[PDB]
Amino acid sequence: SSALFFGNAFIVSAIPIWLYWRIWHMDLIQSAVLYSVMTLVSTYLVAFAYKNVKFVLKHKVAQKREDAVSKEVTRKLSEADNRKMSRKEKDERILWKKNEVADYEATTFSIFYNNTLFLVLVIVASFFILKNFNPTVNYILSISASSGLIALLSTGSK
Amino acid sequence: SDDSFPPEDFGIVSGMLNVKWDRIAPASNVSHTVVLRPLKAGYFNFTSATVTYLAQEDGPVV
């Protein structure tokens, strides 16, 4: 799970580089290091944001899965095995599997929410703020601001 | 004459275009379809296109 989270964070932080790869194509032999370092720092910040958001939303997700918990209760109990089962282990196993699926769905939702928020302000920034500043500096600052806001929306400790 | 053209984003067909025609006739013209061949995607500027006339009546460049 840690490895897949690592890879997902890196790929979602690198896909902006994927769309910025051939769109301008300025000195790749020298801009590759800049792209790598920005991707790494964005990956770290977005991973911190993902951890914070999943931790804060797990409280709601606990009761969000209650209907599915009861649905699995129905099947785990509607059997002659449940007539002479442990009568408690069933609850433990269904809680474990529902927690696992809840964590998976919550992480997916958070990752894609941050990804969707990533490509909202960057386009308008590159379209407008280039009037007075260098386009490359504008793209760099837009990416930095997007990463910072993605990190800050997690905790929100204003 | 293609004096004021962006060399980085647009390339001229016949190098530095310097076309002399000296003809006023419905028969034909040498070339008025300048094919600027771009190299890569980006921001392109339509700077200008130099069109001068060495009027045989006077002689100095217009």
What is the dihedral sign for C-alpha A147, A150, A151, A157?
A: positive
- Nearest to residue A92, comparing CAs of A73, A74, A75? A73
Instruction: Give chain B's count of helices (H) and strands (E).
Output: 0, 2
| Helix/strand/coil (H/E/C) assignment for every residue in A58-124 | HHHHHHHCHHHHHHHHHHHHCCHHHHCCCCCHHHHHHHHHHHHHHHHHHHHHHHHHHHHHHHHHHHH
Question: Residue A22: closest CA among chain B residues belongs to which residue?
Answer: B41
Q: Report the 10 Å Cβ neighbour count for A90.
A: 18
* Cα separations in angstroms, A141 against A29, A93, A110, A135: 21, 48, 24, 10
Geometric angle at alpha carbon A117, from A114 and A118, rounded to 5°? 85
Q: Report the structure determination method.
A: cryo-EM
Query: What is the rounded radius of gyration, in angstroms, for the C-alpha atoms of chain A?
Result: 22
Tokens of A126: 């590159």
Contact residues on chain A for B40, CB-CB shorter than 8 A: 25
- Distance CA(A141)–CA(A44), nearest Å, equals 17
Query: Which residues neighbour B23 within 8 Å (Cβ) at sequence distance 6 or greater?
Result: B29, B30
Q: What's this structure's resolution in Å?
A: 2.7
- DSSP conformational letter for A41: H
Tokens of A62: 């606990």
Query: How far does A13 lie from chain B, in Å, by closest CA?
Result: 24
For chain B positions 2-61, those within 8 Å of chain A (CB to CB) are 40-42
